[model samples]
Target: KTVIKNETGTISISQLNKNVWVHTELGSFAVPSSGLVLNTSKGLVLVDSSWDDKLTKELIEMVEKKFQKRVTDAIITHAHADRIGGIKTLKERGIKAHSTALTAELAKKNGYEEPLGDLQTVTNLKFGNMKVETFYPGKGHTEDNIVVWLPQYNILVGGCLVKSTSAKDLGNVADAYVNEWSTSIENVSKRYRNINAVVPSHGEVGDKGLLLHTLDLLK
Candidate 1:
């Protein structure tokens, strides 16, 4: 059964029966993609905003209803439009946004203003009673990509890197640094055997055991 918890604010997480909810941004990426809604103390910390403004707003609205609050932060997992495209709208609303230092640098290189300040790299956040850890695990997807770790829930929010592209082969080789990316994945997997669930930015979320499969494929 999907359960909802009411704390300082209402917080709910689940996809089907697990209480995990996908912060669906409505329409596809004009291609075929959806983003996720994440639970946090402030509200929902959107992992990656889907493509286009219209869709993202729709997703944000859905998230607000679920949590009974607005999106507190939008973490641009990487530089792709599918990942950071909705940042403009989020910034307009004054919702705090975050990007890794490397990502901020890349944004400038790509002619986009660094929307939010450098992310509080390597820090733990407390949302209501839930705890999340953010870190730039490695620089494969992009020098700026990072993952969120929900210690309490034993969930790893892998921005990309984990499964790679949705339709194409398992990677976005355009700007990917193979060696570094592979190393990061290995490091993350080795560091925590307790990561009970893995949530990739795209593709399905699954168990930590998938890490071995991910690494084996890389090799």
Candidate 2:
């Protein structure tokens, strides 16, 4: 409901609700990348990092100053640079990074600081008063792509698995499982039938229309 900050026109922070905020940063690909920043009594729980350490560091600084809380942990959505680019920064800052075993393996393979890789297919976590869940609905954007759900706010951080309505086609399908993409969306849609907002890796946040738009592009 409010824009808290805009740094150098590259990074923008917009509050999603009382505790959850969405941060958008420009990537080297000339496209914008989006992630979630959750403010809780414990600290801050970041859903995804910026495209690189520099941007992610700035993001941490802004949120920390705004919320007056240090980042306690971050949940990586996949192994892609756009998602895991700041793994090293998180490690250096002593902030725990969470991801699946497969994503950790891919992170190492892709030359990033590996995350905890301790999350399961359906892992629910309670950070202070905020409740967050990460779900692995097979494969779509990548072999290890996952979505973060906020049960309190009914927001689905769909990551790159679900595209934005502005996306003309699947942005990057080189490492994607095209055949299983639609089914993966179905799994997510079924899981969160009462979604209030759907946040994609890139572009504006919307509701279930973005998911339906993605399914159409896949066909």
Candidate 3:
């Protein structure tokens, strides 16, 4: 797969399919974090922003330049810095940031701009031509963790709730629900049976094997 690596190599964006792209930021300088930058009929929709405003600005510029269109909205799947760190930038840029109410409250507590808390347990959103769904499948990596599903592409943006195949163990569980994490994974597994790609917030993007790998690590 061809990758578009920025000058500093701190961020990289690669095409995952015809209309979908995967982005990984912070490079080797820090533990890499991944998200989705999707090209839709209306405008670009980001699944999660970069770690901070500066990096997010760079990310925005990169995708906008490549697509020759502006990003109209972004989805926050959790409250961690890796997920909602650049919410302030989104507000300043007039991009609609959507998240669950619990995630918005946690973001406020975490010192980030609280996103629109209008999402429900299972909300289906249409961004331009793409059909996207935000699902709250119990609790896992964080109490407010959720996942984004692209039904057309069969892609699940698992956020931090789903671990990468390379993960040795759950990264940080300070805000995680240990007892419910596995149950959450099971819910995801049963919900999407035709998954083609599972994008973890922290590792290489792979197929359903990543899901199996996550449950293996939880043991």
Candidate 4:
């Protein structure tokens, strides 16, 4: 379980069992299928909307009930449908969404509609006491992929960069850059050492070592 609280303009997030959680301009996110939720000071901020419209609405409604704030920002980790599918619902709620430029291109290539020229990519943001730094670890699972780092909590939301079990053997060849994909994982593994937790899009969340192991499996 993760709990978010703001004290004196600083937001702090705590995960049970000594797990690390960090507050963000978005909301509190859990590992595995829980994705990301931001307990935003302004309103709700979300990362990776679920796969279906109903699921996305349920998640959003859940957030509204828990925090009593409308979602103001929707952050997409990658261009995959499972990751960005709920974007339509988010827009209906008057939420402003964001993602890397690559994501936009890929989404359109895959038949997603409505390209808003004014969208922003998350480079840096703060929620309560938490500070999040966004980075493009390079094209692992997809080209326009990005991640969020909670330096304060030692959490690295690697998304699909560090693939879990379901991803290692089954690569999405449709749009996957296989050579770049594997190299990208190697790059990510060597890139950050302080990462204690890694959350991916398809499977359970893991530790830094698990990320390394997954990279080896890809190799």
Q: Evaluate model 2: give its TM-score.
A: 0.97
On the 0 to 100 scale, the lDDT of residue 145 in model 3 is: 92
Superposed on all Cα atoms, model 1 deviates from the true structure by an RMSD in Å of 5.4
- Candidate 3 clashes between residue pairs 3 or more apart in a chain or in different chains: none
lDDT of 1 at 36: 51
lDDT, model 4: 0.62
Top-down lDDT ranking: 2, 3, 1, 4
lDDT comparing candidate 3 with the true structure: 0.90
Compared with the true structure, all predictions reach lDDT values of 0.65, 0.91, 0.90, 0.62
Q: Is candidate 1 or candidate 4 better by TM-score?
A: 1
Evaluated at residue 50, the lDDT of candidate 4 is: 64
TM-score to native of every candidate shown: 0.80, 0.97, 0.97, 0.76
* lDDT per residue (tens digit) for residues 13-59 in model 1: 34631223554322332234434566655576777776666666656
Distance from true location, Cα of 65 in model 2, Å: 0.9
Q: Summarize candidate 2's per-residue lDDT along 70-144 as a digit string, tens digits.
A: 999999999998998988899999999999999999999998889999999999999999999999998899999
Query: What are the per-residue Cα lDDT tens digits for candidate 3 across 92-152?
Result: 9999999999999999899888899889999999988999999999888999999999999
- Per-residue CA lDDT of model 4 for 77-127, tens digit only, reads 777766776777877878766777778777788776432323344377765
Clashing pairs in 1: 13-19, 13-20, 14-19, 14-20, 14-21, 15-20, 23-37, 41-127, 41-128
Sorted on TM-score, highest at the top, how do the candidates line up?
A: 2, 3, 1, 4
